[PDB]
Structure formats: structure tokens, C-alpha cells
Scaffold this active site. Structure first.
Site, mmCIF file in Angstrom:
data_model
loop_
_atom_site.group_PDB
_atom_site.id
_atom_site.type_symbol
_atom_site.label_atom_id
_atom_site.label_comp_id
_atom_site.label_asym_id
_atom_site.label_seq_id
_atom_site.Cartn_x
_atom_site.Cartn_y
_atom_site.Cartn_z
ATOM 1 C CG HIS C 96 -2.362 0.394 0.823
ATOM 2 N ND1 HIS C 96 -3.415 0.284 1.704
ATOM 3 C CD2 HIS C 96 -2.881 0.903 -0.320
ATOM 4 C CE1 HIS C 96 -4.521 0.706 1.120
ATOM 5 N NE2 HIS C 96 -4.225 1.089 -0.109
ATOM 6 C CG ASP C 119 -6.218 -0.636 4.597
ATOM 7 O OD1 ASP C 119 -5.984 -1.671 5.256
ATOM 8 O OD2 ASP C 119 -5.350 -0.060 3.903
ATOM 9 C CG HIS C 121 -4.401 -2.169 8.914
ATOM 10 N ND1 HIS C 121 -4.459 -3.107 7.904
ATOM 11 C CD2 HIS C 121 -4.207 -2.864 10.060
ATOM 12 C CE1 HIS C 121 -4.307 -4.315 8.418
ATOM 13 N NE2 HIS C 121 -4.153 -4.194 9.725
ATOM 14 C CG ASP C 123 -2.586 1.599 5.573
ATOM 15 O OD1 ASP C 123 -2.456 0.922 6.614
ATOM 16 O OD2 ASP C 123 -2.828 1.110 4.450
ATOM 17 C CG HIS C 136 2.650 -1.762 4.137
ATOM 18 N ND1 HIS C 136 2.076 -3.003 3.948
ATOM 19 C CD2 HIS C 136 3.086 -1.743 5.419
ATOM 20 C CE1 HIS C 136 2.161 -3.703 5.065
ATOM 21 N NE2 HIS C 136 2.770 -2.961 5.974
ATOM 22 C CG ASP C 227 -4.946 -3.276 2.376
ATOM 23 O OD1 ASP C 227 -4.573 -4.311 1.787
ATOM 24 O OD2 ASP C 227 -4.529 -2.942 3.509
ATOM 25 C CG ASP C 229 -5.347 -5.330 4.986
ATOM 26 O OD1 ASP C 229 -4.283 -5.034 5.573
ATOM 27 O OD2 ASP C 229 -6.222 -4.481 4.698
ATOM 28 C CD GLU C 272 -0.309 -4.350 1.458
ATOM 29 O OE1 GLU C 272 0.313 -5.428 1.582
ATOM 30 O OE2 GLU C 272 0.240 -3.234 1.574
HETATM 31 MN MN LIG Z 1 -3.386 -0.711 3.621
HETATM 32 MN MN LIG Z 2 -4.650 -3.161 5.674
#
Ligand SMILES: [Mn+2]
Ligand SMILES: [Mn+2]
Ligand SMILES: [Mn+2]
Ligand SMILES: [Mn+2]
Ligand SMILES: [Mn+2]
Ligand SMILES: [Mn+2]
Lengths: 313, 313, 313
Positions: C96, C119, C121, C123, C136, C227, C229, C272
């Protein structure tokens, strides 16, 4: 949010014996260490030493009545002292029978407590309606007042005093309810949200109404009795009475994050985790893992994030 | 709710042959015994003996047209007699082609029937739009009236008479629809709730609108044509045309519990269960298990519980 | 919807190296062929040849700063040219970190772009808040204007110019946010829908508000930084930072189908995906499969069906 950890390694509320290892395995996952990683004061009162009662024949159909009855009596006094030390009692136990002792002890100090019971079952069978005789499926029956005079004198429970009405409690997650239990439900007018109401309303609205129904009139201490078999077994497989079509991991987390947010959590039970019932080492860690996340959510950990009252930049 | 079980071991609506074992394996799960464990009168009309038609070359692209056509003709008369005996016809079959015979036979006695079709597919291809030639993907095309004059004369279907308009039916669960099928959808104004509408509205609202759209004006007999590939394959893996991103087990149960509650269920199909397509003995039991739960829900079993009109205390 | 495919085989935004094979494996799934099977003009700009920077010691805690910084600089000019050729840039990358180059390059031609970041997260760590040093997990920190003067001078990023405010962006899917990141969130007033808001509101309402918050005032070009994830790992297991309790496959599809429907999609990142992180050949195909479905949804494929402007009957 100040917690009071209580180990309750009891299994005689049902057949399978590995549930008494719950306190142990949850502690290895690092619960006490993770709770501290947060904003709480953790005080471990250890694992209650449950004495062995050799001579405990069944009462009609009831099984190990003096063993279960004494284990709750023991835990009730424990939860009472902790609540007296101004702490959120955390009962990491085995089977759900212990709930009798927790709701009892908790109430001694807080008669105006409200109960949210996350379970796939209602656990409201009477010693006279239960066909299994397993007491971890009758705890609610000993606690309700309307059900006073319906619950026979069972060896090991003379110390019992129904501490809650049919209105001070809400069920969430139901999907395996017996005929007699459903009769009590409708008859006593107990408020509940089975998997059907969760499907129809959404876990969001479900929690809106639940907390609204218990805190509408006034605010009061809340007791969360969480049976891990409440969540879908794909999330908590190592448990004695799994039923498919359960609450998701996400929903499990939403319920507690919302409970925490009331700032009214007073008592919490995390029950029915049985490692020896996992078919793989992973199903064990997965059941434990989810049990610990459910608990942290109860004391603060939020999915959107968390941060102290400081300037991070 | 009085049921009329009909075994329809037919597979020529598609390639794979194990779907004709559906009637069999569902019966071993104890369906008839579980239906009785409830509040219904179960009368088994057995497994229709589907005669073999050796000489049945394809009609242009259509495959086994006289075999499929005769199997529905046969089943239509069966569902008609059962509806005449005042019973909810239960067609435990193989492939979805048989739906033609079920909706037809059912309608003979109830021209005002409403159809809820839970499927990952619309199964509304015409003999002239289908690229597979598999008839278990064309049943809806022979039943709709607007589509009269669009469906060529196919060997084995001269007995057919379109019994439903584009409005008497609602699709639930769509996630794999062909170009031509989507054209018919929009063009004929067929009401549907694909996985997109389910995601956006929630299965609760979805069922509110579906039953509202079919029962708004007046109440009418309802026909539920349930294709097991409607549910996510993680729930019903042993089926010929699985598509990921399906209805959950919970949603599957919500749809039917709601249908049952209308007290208007008249016809029910449980299709596309193919044991031989399970990659493990467990995927077989899992697909069958879920098929049986879906059925019980259709006749009464509720997740919040069930109880007779008696005093349990 | 006219696309502009850009291969970005970069992995130095994080530890694990298989993410640079993303461009490759997605191409084998037949992405470009499937995009064409639809209604779009596909123009492949190939895999950016990311040059090797041998001498790239860490900057304090930041890792491979000149490698990541140059890879985004390189990708930014690429996304800019494509947007200049009137095409929806598609950045199939590794980690990312590259998002920095995509949002930057995209904005050069469209300063009024809106960002939806799916995401698990945020980030949004700064080189001074990140404890991992992995870039990332810091891309958003280099792009926000309010965070100007908080981001130190890191080797390889002098070409950077924060192109978005804290309001031009919405997070969807959050479930693993650091303390400092959560502080920036609340402090900068960034709009987000973590897994908690998704649970409470439903993915339907979530997308209603998200698109409403970015397109309320006026319409503007939209950049989707996806992303993998973000989705539950049971759907996209082959990725470096999995977190349980994620977006379902269905929800993943709903987000993008809705984005496509705005007709405002301008930039898209699919990040990712790391094949070498799959524990089985199936977890690889499953992660790739879901990555491709997410992409097609972004360019038109609808679950209810699709059909050209012609008469199919
Ligand atoms: Mn990410
Ligand atoms: Mn993530
Ligand atoms: Mn229980
Ligand atoms: Mn239970
Ligand atoms: Mn079908
Ligand atoms: Mn189907």
C-alpha cells in the site's frame, strides 16, 4: 472500568469435563496482561478452589445438585466481595450453571441489576422441565422471582433467593429453545432477540432496543452472562453445546462494545469454553482467541481504535 | 400446515446425475420423522417412478427435452391431486427443471398462486436464449404468460400452459444472471432481490417487500421454489451450480420462517441437492442438513422456540 | 468506463516480498480479458520496471525510504499520463505504500478528487508515529495537508506535495488502528466507518453516507484505494497483515458496485495481494479470485445481471 477476575473451574453443570480448564487456558492467552495493556485496574482473585462432593446422587433428574449448588454459593460470596471492593466482577468459568452464583452474588450488593444473556439457549429449564438434568441449562430458572414456587427444593440450593424478575433480563442469540422454556418465555413475558430478530432487525437495532428496554426508565448496574456457544461455532467451536446459525464474530464484538459504552457494565460471565472439545489445536486457540476479544471489548478495546488523553503529534 | 410429500428423482434437467438421489438422502436425514415431530400431518406419496425415454435427441440446443417435459407432466398431475387433497405439496427433487411441473400442477387447482423463487440464478432462459441447453435453467421461461409466443414448440412440452404472469413472482438471491435473462427481467418488469438488494436492504426488509408485493392487493396461495444453490456454497456445497457470495444459513432460515408465518404456504420445492457432488462425506451431510432445516422452517420450526397449546408448568 | 491498467510490482513498503507478484498473478486470472468481456476499453501500460536502490539505509525508523519514495514518484507520473489520456487508472500493485504515488499522480490532473479507502487499517502513521517503520502503513500521512509540517523530510519523498485534506477522504473497514492513528483520526476529524459502524448501520447505509459525504456539495472524481486485507481473511487470506472480523465478500462487492454506479470512479488501487503468503494453492486462487471480482464490480459487472443495449428476444 475496574475489573475483578474470578476463576471458576467448574464443569458439573453438564457432562463433558474440559470446561473446568477454561480459567486456565484463557489466562495463558494473556487476558490479564491484555486487560492491563488498556485502561483498567486488573486484580486477580485467582481460581476458586472448588471442593469435591463425593456423595451427590441425582435429585430425580437433576445431576450433581450439591456440587453445582455449592459451587454457585461459593462464587456468589466471591462476586459479592469483589462488587464490594468496587470492581467489575469477571467470572471465567466452565459451564453456565455457575451463572446462578454470579447473578446472586452480584445482586446482593446491587438489587437493581439488569441482565443481558447472550446464549444460543435460554437456560431457563426448571428441575421439573429439564429432560437432560444438566444444570447448566437451568440457571435462569433459579434466579427469576415469578418462577418462585415452581422450582422444587433441590439439594445444594437452599441458599438461593431469586434475585431478578422476568423483565430485568434480555436474551440475545437464541436458536435452540425447548418447548417448556418457550412456554415460560411467552408466559412470563421475557424480552428476547433470537437469531430471527437479529436477522430481521440487525444487530444494531437489536442492541438499541435491548439497552433501551433495560435502561429506559432509569440507569442500573448491568450483568452480562456470555455463553460462548452464543456465537456461531465457526468462531467458538470448542464448546459443549454448539448450534449452527449463530452470532458472527463481528456481532459478538458489537454487542460488547456497545455494552462497554453504557459505562454501566458491572458483572460479566464468559462461559462454556471447553478446550478438550476442540477437534484441532487451532479450534482451541480460535475459541479462546474469540473469548478474549469478546472480553477486551467489554472493557474498552474498540475496533475504530483507542488512544490515551495525550497529544500524539 | 398439512404437507404432501412427493419424491421427484429427476436429473436430466442438467448434466450431473447424482441429483436424482436427492429424494433418497433427504428421507434418510429423517425429514418425514422430523416434520411429524412438529404440528403437521405428513403423507408420503413416495418417489415418482420416472420412466426412461431412450430416444430423446436434443432439440436444437435443448437437451433431453422429452425426458424433462414428461417428468414435469408427470409431477404436475401429482401436485394437482395433492393440492386437491388439501395439502401443501412438497417436491423433493433433483434438478430445477421439474419446477415447470410443480408450478403447473399447483396452479391447476389454484390459478391465483404467487411465486417466490430463491435461487442464485433466474432460470428464465428460453430454448432460444440458453447457451447450455440445460433445461433446469429454463423452467421459468415455460411458465410465464408474457413469454407466450417466444417459447418454441419443444418435444415433450405440448402439455404446457403458462400459468403465471411476470408480476406473480419474486426472485430472491440472484448473483449469476445471463445477458438474455437480465433483458427479460428488466423488459418484463419482474420483481427481484439479488444479493445486491439483500446487501443494501437487509433480509428483513427484503422479505417485508417480497411478501408485500405478492400479498398487497389480496391474499393468495404461495409457491416457494427453493434451489439450494441459493444459499452460499459454504452451506450447501453438494449442488451442481455453486456461486460464491450467497445467502447465509441464517438468511435462508429467515426467508422460510417468514413464509411459514403468512400461513399462506401452499407449494414448496427443495431442489438441486446432489450428494455425489460433495467432495467429502461432511459436505454431503452439511448440504442435506441445511436442506432439511430449510424445510422444517417452512412448516413451523422457529428459532425462538416452539410449544403446544398446553400449560408446561 | 475506460480503464488504464498499471502494473506496480513493489514490496518494499513492508517486509514480506511476494506482494510484487501481484500484478503478475492477477493478470493470469484473466483480468484484462474479463474487463474486455464487459463494456470497457482496456489499455495495458504494463508492469512499471521498478529500479533497484542498493544504498537505502533506514531513516531513523523508516525502512527503504528511497526505494518506496522513488516507486511512488515513478507511479505518480504514470497515473498522471493515464488520467491525461482520459482513463480510469488501475494500479495493480504490491504493498500500500504505492498509494502515495497513485493519489498524487491522480490529483495532478484532478485536484478535486475524493478518496474512499477500504482497509482494515488507516495507514495514516507518520514517520514519527510508526513503530514498525513499514511505509505501507504511512501512505495517508504523506497525502494529507493538515499533516503538513508533521511529516519530516524523508529521503525519497522531496517530490511529495500533500494533495488531500482530512475531509476529502472516508475510511471503510477499519478494525486494527494504532493509538497515534486514532488520535489523528479524531483530531483531524476524518470521516470513517470501521467494522463497528458497518455492524451498526449496515453496508447499505454505510455506502449511502460515504458517497453522500464526498459528493454532497458537488460531484468530483473519485479514487478508490482498496487494500485486500479490508475483506475478512476467509476471503483474501494471501495478504501480509490479516485481521479477523472483516468485510464479507458480499459487502466487498456492494461497496464497488455502488462506487461504479456513481459513474464517478476515476482511480482504483487493488493492493496487498501476496500469493507467497497463501498456506495452500487454494488460498492463493481464493485471494486472487476475490481481487478480480472486486475489480470487475468496479467497472460494471453487476450481481443482478448485465446486458447490452439490444433486444435479446
Ligand atoms: Mn493498507
Ligand atoms: Mn490493511
Ligand atoms: Mn448457556
Ligand atoms: Mn448455550
Ligand atoms: Mn435453479
Ligand atoms: Mn441456481
Amino acid at each position: 472500568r475496574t475489573i475483578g477476575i474470578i476463576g471458576a473451574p467448574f464443569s458439573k453443570g453438564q457432562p463433558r469435563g474440559g470446561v473446568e480448564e477454561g480459567p486456565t487456558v484463557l489466562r495463558k492467552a494473556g487476558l490479564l496482561e491484555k486487560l492491563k495493556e488498556q485502561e483498567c485496574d486488573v486484580k486477580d482473585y485467582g481460581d476458586l478452589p472448588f471442593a469435591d462432593i463425593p456423595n451427590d446422587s441425582p435429585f430425580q433428574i437433576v445431576k450433581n445438585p450439591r456440587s453445582v449448588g455449592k459451587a454457585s454459593e461459593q462464587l456468589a460470596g466471591k462476586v459479592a466481595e469483589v462488587k464490594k471492593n468496587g470492581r467489575i466482577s469477571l467470572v471465567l468459568g466452565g459451564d453456565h450453571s455457575l451463572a446462578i452464583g454470579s447473578i446472586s452474588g452480584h445482586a446482593r450488593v446491587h438489587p437493581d441489576l439488569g441482565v443481558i444473556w447472550v446464549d444460543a439457549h435460554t437456560d431457563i429449564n426448571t428441575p421439573l422441565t429439564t429432560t437432560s438434568g444438566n444444570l447448566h441449562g437451568q440457571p435462569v430458572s433459579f434466579l427469576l422471582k415469578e418462577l418462585k414456587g415452581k422450582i422444587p427444593d433441590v439439594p445444594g440450593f437452599s441458599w438461593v433467593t431469586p434475585c431478578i424478575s422476568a423483565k430485568d433480563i434480555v436474551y440475545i442469540g437464541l436458536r435452540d429453545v425447548d418447548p417448556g422454556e418457550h412456554y415460560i418465555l411467552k408466559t412470563l413475558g421475557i424480552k428476547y432477540f433470537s437469531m430471527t430478530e437479529v436477522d430481521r432487525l440487525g444487530i444494531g437495532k437489536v442492541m438499541e432496543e435491548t439497552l433501551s428496554y433495560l435502561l429506559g426508565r432509569k440507569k442500573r448496574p448491568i450483568h452480562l452472562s456470555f455463553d460462548v456457544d452464543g456465537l456461531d461455532p465457526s468462531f467458538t467451536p470448542a464448546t459443549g453445546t454448539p448450534v449452527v446459525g449463530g452470532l458472527t464474530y463481528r456481532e459478538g464484538l458489537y454487542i460488547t462494545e456497545e455494552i462497554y459504552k453504557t459505562g454501566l457494565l458491572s458483572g460479566l460471565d464468559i462461559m462454556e469454553v471447553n478446550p478438550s472439545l476442540g477437534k484441532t489445536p487451532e479450534e482451541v486457540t480460535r475459541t479462546v482467541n474469540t473469548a478474549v476479544a469478546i472480553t477486551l471489548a467489554c472493557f474498552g478495546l474498540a475496533r475504530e481504535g483507542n488512544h490515551k488523553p495525550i497529544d500524539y503529534l
